Amino acid sequence: GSMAQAGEVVLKMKVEGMTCHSCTSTIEGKIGKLQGVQRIKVSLDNQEATIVYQPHLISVEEMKKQIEAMGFPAFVKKQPKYLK
């Protein structure tokens, strides 16, 4: 069936702890509350979020854009426009 990311998608984005995790407790429950999500993991320090989700509800990447907007920049892998 799914050769790799067909039935689902995976985005291991690597956050920046801002200064020293100014919050991130809220981010725990934020990421865990994302709909259409299958698996859900969040690392320490750089809070490298590794969430698996089905590709037709929402993009966890957009959800992490909020994490970056509040002050936790993320070194997202998915950079198609930048890639050639």
- Binding site: which residues? 20, 23
Residues in binding site for Cu(+):
20, 23
DSSP string, the chain: --SSSSS-EEEEEEE--TTT-SS-HHHHHHHHT-TTEEEEEE-STTT-EEEEE-TTT--HHHHHHHHHHTT--EE-S--TTT--
State the Cα–Cα distance between residues 1 and 26, nearest whole angstrom.
36
